């Protein structure tokens, strides 16, 4: 019954709102109180006279990782609201979050990107794409593929009510390595898929095959994740004096 797929849609959209303070709709309002724009070395030092936040590239990287840690917490809180998620085997909950969290982070980061740059510090700042592309040789391309994905992902013009269902689908992937009870996970994702399909078809009636096109974006995400972790291993051996947050260290071990 369709009425049950709309209730699920509304439920998840409500929890997403409650779980993620910087929504896509607020980010689009900002990008179209305006942000401080960092674009070079000196605007970054200026950026602290107006914003409040050991070499530049490292420090930028550490900020990205700290907001990843913050994002992991919000995604975790959002997952608990997905009906059936908390009744799963505790080890699988951990597995679902372990392999889903990076895919969601870059899904939602696209909401804060345009082709020119990315919102930071809860939207108070805006770091341009080329300044990021210009950092020291390892870090200078840590954000570029995310920009590439974001530009194609944002072409679908999903809004938040769409992303809430989509993010739910990503968490509940039976595909993940080490899952003990694949079946009850898939039974939920199948119901989330049903909710998303009806959601896209109602929210974007003129956007044919958006559902299918959204599902194909699930391959670009996994590529972003992969080159991210290899990039992370290059840093760990190139920067033996730079630490990483253990919540992220524990999650990045696959």
Swiss-Prot record:
Residue positions of motif 9aaTAD: 246-254
Signals that turn on the gene: (Microbial infection) Expression increases when incubated with M.tuberculosis or its lipoprotein LpqH; induction is TLR2-dependent (at protein level).
Annotated tissue distribution: Highest expression in adipose tissue. Lower in skeletal muscle, spleen, heart and liver. Also detectable in placenta, lung and ovary.
Name the UniProt record assigns to this protein: Peroxisome proliferator-activated receptor gamma
Chain residues that bind rosiglitazone: 65-68, 102, 228, 252
Keywords, sorted A to Z: Activator, Biological rhythms, Cytoplasm, Diabetes mellitus, Disease variant, DNA-binding, Glycoprotein, Isopeptide bond, Metal-binding, Nucleus, Obesity, Phosphoprotein, Receptor, Transcription, Transcription regulation, Ubl conjugation, Zinc, Zinc-finger
Cross-link (Glycyl lysine isopeptide (Lys-Gly) (interchain with G-Cter in ubiquitin)): 18
Species annotation: Homo sapiens
Activity regulation (UniProt): PDPK1 activates its transcriptional activity independently of its kinase activity.
Function per UniProt: Nuclear receptor that binds peroxisome proliferators such as hypolipidemic drugs and fatty acids. Once activated by a ligand, the nuclear receptor binds to DNA specific PPAR response elements (PPRE) and modulates the transcription of its target genes, such as acyl-CoA oxidase. It therefore controls the peroxisomal beta-oxidation pathway of fatty acids. Key regulator of adipocyte differentiation and glucose homeostasis. ARF6 acts as a key regulator of the tissue-specific adipocyte P2 (aP2) enhancer.
Record-annotated disulphide pairs: none
One function term, GO molecular function aspect: LBD domain binding
Disease: Defects in PPARG can lead to type 2 insulin-resistant diabetes and hyptertension. PPARG mutations may be associated with colon cancer.
Cellular location(s): Nucleus; Cytoplasm
Gene Ontology biological process terms in this record: BMP signaling pathway; cell differentiation; cell fate commitment; cell maturation; cellular response to hypoxia; cellular response to insulin stimulus; cellular response to low-density lipoprotein particle stimulus; epithelial cell differentiation
Family, per entry: Belongs to the nuclear hormone receptor family. NR1 subfamily.
Domain comment in the entry: The 9aaTAD motif is a transactivation domain present in a large number of yeast and animal transcription factors.
Subunit structure: Interacts with FOXO1 (acetylated form). Heterodimer with other nuclear receptors, such as RXRA. The heterodimer with the retinoic acid receptor RXRA is called adipocyte-specific transcription factor ARF6. Interacts with NCOA6 coactivator, leading to a strong increase in transcription of target genes. Interacts with coactivator PPARBP, leading to a mild increase in transcription of target genes. Interacts with NOCA7 in a ligand-inducible manner. Interacts with NCOA1 and NCOA2 LXXLL motifs. Interacts with ASXL1, ASXL2, DNTTIP2, FAM120B, MAP2K1/MEK1, NR0B2, PDPK1, PRDM16, PRMT2 and TGFB1I1.
Name of encoding gene: PPARG
Reported effect, residue 67 to H: In colon cancer; sporadic; somatic mutation; partial loss of ligand-binding
NR LBD domain ranges (all copies): 4-254
Record's comment on post-translational modification: Phosphorylated in basal conditions and dephosphorylated when treated with the ligand. May be dephosphorylated by PPP5C. Ubiquitinated by E3 ubiquitin-protein ligase complex containing FBXO9; leading to proteasomal degradation. Ubiquitinated at Lys-18 by TRIM55 leading to proteasomal degradation. Ubiquitinated by E3 ubiquitin-protein ligase STUB1/CHIP; leading to proteasomal degradation.
Cellular component terms (Gene Ontology): chromatin; cytosol; intracellular membrane-bounded organelle; nucleoplasm; nucleus; receptor complex; RNA polymerase II transcription regulator complex
């Amino acid at each position: 019954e369709s009425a049950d797929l709309r209730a699920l849609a509304k439920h998840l959209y409500d929890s997403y709102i409650k779980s993620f303070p910087l929504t896509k709709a607020k980010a689009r309002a900002i990008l179209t109180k305006s942000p401080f724009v960092i674009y070079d070395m000196n605007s970054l030092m200026m950026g602290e006279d107006k914003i409040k936040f050991k070499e530049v590239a490292i420090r930028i990287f550490q900020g990205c990782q700290f907001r990843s840690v913050e994002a992991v917490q919000e995604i975790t809180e959002y997952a608990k609201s997905i009906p059936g998620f908390v009744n799963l085997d505790l080890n699988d909950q951990v597995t679902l979050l372990k392999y889903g969290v990076h895919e969601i982070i870059y899904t939602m980061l696209a909401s804060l990107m345009n082709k020119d740059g990315v919102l930071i510090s809860e939207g108070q700042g805006f770091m341009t794409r080329e300044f990021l592309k210009s950092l020291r040789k390892p870090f200078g391309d840590f954000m570029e593929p995310k920009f590439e994905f974001a530009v194609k992902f944002n072409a679908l013009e999903l809004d938040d009510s769409d992303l809430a269902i989509f993010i739910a689908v990503i968490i509940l992937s039976g595909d993940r390595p080490g899952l003990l009870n694949v079946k009850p996970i898939e039974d939920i994702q199948d119901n989330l898929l049903q909710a998303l399909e009806l959601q896209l078809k109602l929210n974007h009636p003129e956007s044919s095959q958006l559902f299918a096109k959204l599902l194909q974006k699930m391959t670009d995400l996994r590529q972003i994740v992969t080159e991210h972790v290899q990039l992370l291993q290059v840093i760990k051996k190139t920067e033996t004096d730079m630490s990483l947050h253990p919540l992220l260290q524990e999650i990045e071990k696959d």
